[PDB]
Structure formats: structure tokens, C-alpha cells
Design an enzyme around this catalytic site. Structure first.
Site, PDB file in Angstrom:
ATOM      1  N   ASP A  35      -5.982  51.612  20.703  1.00 33.07           N
ATOM      2  CA  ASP A  35      -6.661  52.749  21.336  1.00 33.07           C
ATOM      3  C   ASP A  35      -8.183  52.590  21.278  1.00 33.07           C
ATOM      4  O   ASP A  35      -8.789  52.778  20.224  1.00 33.07           O
ATOM      5  CB  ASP A  35      -6.231  54.042  20.628  1.00 33.07           C
ATOM      6  CG  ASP A  35      -6.971  55.285  21.132  1.00 33.07           C
ATOM      7  OD1 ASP A  35      -7.383  55.341  22.303  1.00 33.07           O
ATOM      8  OD2 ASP A  35      -7.132  56.226  20.337  1.00 33.07           O
ATOM      9  N   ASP A 219     -10.463  54.142  28.157  1.00 33.65           N
ATOM     10  CA  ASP A 219      -9.655  54.599  27.026  1.00 33.65           C
ATOM     11  C   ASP A 219      -8.241  54.060  27.109  1.00 33.65           C
ATOM     12  O   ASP A 219      -7.413  54.596  27.846  1.00 33.65           O
ATOM     13  CB  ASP A 219      -9.641  56.123  26.986  1.00 33.65           C
ATOM     14  CG  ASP A 219      -8.980  56.683  25.725  1.00 33.65           C
ATOM     15  OD1 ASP A 219      -8.387  55.921  24.918  1.00 33.65           O
ATOM     16  OD2 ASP A 219      -9.068  57.915  25.552  1.00 33.65           O
TER      17      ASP A 219
HETATM   18  C1  LIG Z   1      -1.308  53.952  25.434  1.00 39.45           C
HETATM   19  C2  LIG Z   1      -1.711  54.246  26.683  1.00 39.45           C
HETATM   20  O1  LIG Z   1      -1.537  55.561  26.879  1.00 39.45           O
HETATM   21  C3  LIG Z   1      -1.013  56.114  25.768  1.00 39.45           C
HETATM   22  C4  LIG Z   1      -0.670  57.573  25.611  1.00 39.45           C
HETATM   23  N1  LIG Z   1      -0.898  57.980  24.228  1.00 39.45           N
HETATM   24  C5  LIG Z   1      -0.203  58.996  23.591  1.00 39.45           C
HETATM   25  N2  LIG Z   1       0.887  59.555  24.133  1.00 39.45           N
HETATM   26  C6  LIG Z   1       1.550  60.529  23.522  1.00 39.45           C
HETATM   27  N3  LIG Z   1       1.168  60.994  22.347  1.00 39.45           N
HETATM   28  C7  LIG Z   1       0.083  60.491  21.720  1.00 39.45           C
HETATM   29  S1  LIG Z   1      -0.634  60.909  20.179  1.00 39.45           S
HETATM   30  C8  LIG Z   1      -1.908  59.719  20.337  1.00 39.45           C
HETATM   31  C9  LIG Z   1      -1.799  59.038  21.487  1.00 39.45           C
HETATM   32  C10 LIG Z   1      -0.662  59.459  22.317  1.00 39.45           C
HETATM   33  C11 LIG Z   1      -2.790  57.931  21.854  1.00 39.45           C
HETATM   34  C12 LIG Z   1      -3.410  57.336  20.581  1.00 39.45           C
HETATM   35  C13 LIG Z   1      -4.039  58.464  19.747  1.00 39.45           C
HETATM   36  C14 LIG Z   1      -2.987  59.489  19.280  1.00 39.45           C
HETATM   37  C15 LIG Z   1      -0.854  55.150  24.844  1.00 39.45           C
END
Ligand SMILES: c1coc(CNc2ncnc3sc4c(c23)CCCC4)c1
Ligand SMILES: *[C@@H]1O[C@H](CO)[C@@H](O)[C@H](O)[C@H]1NC(C)=O
Length: 333
Positions: A35, A219
Site C-alpha cells: 500500500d 495509491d
Molecule cells: C489493493 C488495491 O486495492 C485494495 C483495496 N484495499 C482494501 N479493501 C478492503 N478493505 C481494506 S482495509 C485496508 C485496505 C483495504 C487497503 C490497505 C489499508 C487498509 C487493495
């Protein structure tokens, strides 16, 4: 300075992309989102209560099974756009592809069902700068840079559509099998956040939005292209898309009639067709199809800002360059 490390990614539903890391000696394996919007590493802990349903259905780090684990215990809370976790800091060897690194990370003990019962991944590897790290914990890529093993201080993301490879992160370089031609780069506005200036968002040939310039957070942990509620309202109005209860939709048959949306970044137009931003689960005139573009009001100091997430990255293979504080894009394949 002669190594790259690739991690293959699973693509869940075009909305979550994650791959594996090891933590401990021997390595315990976790599915993690890489991320660029954040800078902490964490995974769920074996000290997470099973009354958090997310800690029943995700893998838990058991520190007593790792000979290289070192205690810290400092509590931290990580507040994301979609949800909040808290836990305590720990230190151990993290394996990422062919690389090992002594890393401080979170052992998450509080993992609420919204959103973590819809997360197919276990945890998060923050690929952002130390300035955005909670507790000022040295991020994993900064520690890998310190080793002086990487060929370049860059890392690259391939997110596929939809078996096939779900995606790929390369630490230390890029994978030209997954992009066409050469990178064009856009410099960061400032160090500390993967955010660039955007000089226009066009619908067809008319620049409707961001006419005086705006911000774009690139992002890798965001599913969609996002803008502010106000921006996306105007965008969707321009497209003829309507808000069904939770999301914007078009008639699935009308998706291919929708105009291209272009993002003006660094003197280039990054153009997505309707095939790139409409989830064409059907082409039926009798069904509604959602778009891969959502409102997201990101608070200061990072926002208000657009966020170029997986929707954008699918179209444009992305290199994050810490040597030069810039982001490279090339057409994915
Ligand atoms: C990769 C691309 O999109 C995604 C979508 N990301 C997510 N989807 C559902 N719940 C969560 S909690 C959380 C995240 C996330 C991203 C990271 C920080 C904490 C990942
Ligand atoms: C835990 O790590 C932080 C660095 O973020 C440090 O301030 C603290 O002293 C560490 N605790 C121990 C017991 O080493």
C-alpha cells in the site's frame, strides 16, 4: 546493488490486490496489500481475540514460534479510509520474495468486521514514506534501501484485470513483460507522500474538472480512482451515471457509449476508456453496471485529493521511484 525481488499478487475481484510475505524464523506466511498510501507494516496477531470474527478467518502471527522475534510492545492505532486497526509493535525478519529484512511491524489485536471481514488479505505492507508512518517506525522499503542490495531504489506495480497472473510487485526495478514502451515520470510535489500534481481531468475532449490543478495520490492500496464528493458528482453527471443506493451506476449496455476520461499528469494525458472504468459484469440493457470511480473525501493534510488506485494502475503499470521522488507510468499489458 544487484538484486530485484518480485512478489506475485492475487487479484480479488479487481478491488483487492495482495501477495505474500514471510514473518519470522521459520517464516510464517501472510497475504498482504502493498500500500503506497500508508507506511506501516502489520499483520493480525495470535493475541487477537476470536470475538473479532476477522481474527478467526485470517492468519495470525504467533511470535513464540519465531526464534528471531524481538519484543517491543508499544501500542499503535492505524486509521485508514475504510477502517481502523490497533495493536502493538514487534520486530522480526520479514521475507519479501528473495529479500529478508529486519522490520518493525504491528501485531494487530483489534480488527473490526467492517472492513476486515471483506478483506481477503491478512495485513498491510506500507510502501509510503516515514513521514506518514505511525510511531515514526522505519518503513520496510527504507530498511531494504539501507541494505544496498537493490539494483535501483524503486518499486513497481502491475495489477492485472479479472487463470492469469493477478499482478506483480517488483522491488528494485520493473518487469517489462507487463508494460509497453518506456516510462514517463511525474515528480512528487514534495517528499513524504506519493502524491503528484494533476493538471486536468477530461471527459472526452472537454476538461470539466481539476481545471486549476489538483492533487493525485497514487495509491496502490485503493481500489478505485477517487475524487472528492463534489468532483465525482460532477464527473458522474457528465457521464449520465446515477447513484444507486451506495454506488454510481449506468445501464450495462450503455457502458461502451461513455466517453474516455483523461487525467493530465506531467504534460501527458493518461486516458481510460469506458472499458477501463465500467465494471462490465454484463452488457445487458436489463442490468446495472457500477463504475470503478468512487467519491472519497480524504482529509488534510494529504487531501482534499484525487486518488489513483487500482483502476488507474490496471491501465498504467506504475513505478514508484524513491531515488528521484517521482512516479513512472507506462501502458500495462
Ligand atoms: C489493493 C488495491 O486495492 C485494495 C483495496 N484495499 C482494501 N479493501 C478492503 N478493505 C481494506 S482495509 C485496508 C485496505 C483495504 C487497503 C490497505 C489499508 C487498509 C487493495
Ligand atoms: C519500540 O520501538 C520504538 C521505535 O518506534 C522505540 O521508541 C521504543 O524504545 C521501542 N521499545 C523497546 C522496548 O525497544
Amino acid at each position: 546493488g544487484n538484486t530485484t525481488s518480485s512478489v506475485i499478487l492475487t487479484n480479488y475481484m479487481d478491488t483487492q490486490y495482495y501477495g505474500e510475505i514471510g514473518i519470522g524464523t521459520p517464516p510464517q506466511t501472510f497475504k498482504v496489500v502493498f500500500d503506497t498510501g500508508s507506511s506501516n507494516v502489520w499483520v493480525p496477531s495470535s493475541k487477537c481475540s476470536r470475538l473479532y470474527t476477522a481474527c478467526v478467518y485470517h492468519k495470525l502471527f504467533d511470535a513464540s514460534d519465531s526464534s528471531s522475534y524481538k519484543h517491543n510492545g508499544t501500542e499503535l492505532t492505524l486509521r485508514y479510509s475504510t477502517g481502523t486497526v490497533s495493536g502493538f509493535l514487534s520486530q522480526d525478519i520479514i521475507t519479501v520474495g528473495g529479500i529478508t529484512v529486519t522490520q518493525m511491524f504491528g501485531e494487530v489485536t483489534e480488527m473490526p468486521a467492517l472492513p476486515f471481514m471483506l478483506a481477503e488479505f491478512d495485513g498491510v505492507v506500507g510502501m509510503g514514506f516515514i513521514e506518514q508512518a505511525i510511531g515514526r517506525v522505519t518503513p520496510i522499503f527504507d530498511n531494504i534501501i539501507s541494505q544496498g542490495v537493490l539494483k535501483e531504489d524503486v518499486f513497481s506495480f502491475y495489477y492485472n484485470r479479472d487463470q492469469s497472473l493477478g499482478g506483480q510487485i517488483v522491488l528494485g526495478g520493473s518487469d517489462p513483460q507487463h508494460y509497453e514502451g518506456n516510462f514517463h515520470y511525474i515528480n512528487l510535489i514534495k517528499t513524504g507522500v506519493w502524491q503528484i500534481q494533476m493538471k486536468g481531468v477530461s471527459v472526452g475532449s472537454s476538461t470539466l474538472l481539476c481545471e486549476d490543478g489538483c492533487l493525485a495520490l497514487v495509491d496502490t492500496g485503493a481500489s478505485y480512482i477517487s475524487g472528492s464528493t463534489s468532483s465525482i458528482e460532477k464527473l458522474m453527471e457528465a457521464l449520465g451515471a446515477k447513484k444507486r443506493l451506495f454506488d454510481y451506476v449506468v445501464k450495462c449496455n450503455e457502458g461502451p457509449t461513455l466517453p474516455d476520461i483523461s487525467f493530465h499528469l506531467g504534460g501527458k494525458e493518461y486516458t481510460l476508456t469506458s472499458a477501463d472504468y465500467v465494471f462490465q459484469e454484463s452488457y445487458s440493457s436489463k442490468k446495472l453496471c457500477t463504475l470503478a470511480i468512487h467519491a472519497m473525501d480524504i482529509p488534510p493534510p494529504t487531501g482534499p485529493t484525487w486518488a489513483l488506485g487500482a483502476t488507474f494502475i490496471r491501465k498504467f503499470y506504475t513505478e514508484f521511484d524513491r531515488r528521484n521522488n517521482r512516479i513512472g507510468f507506462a501502458l500495462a499489458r
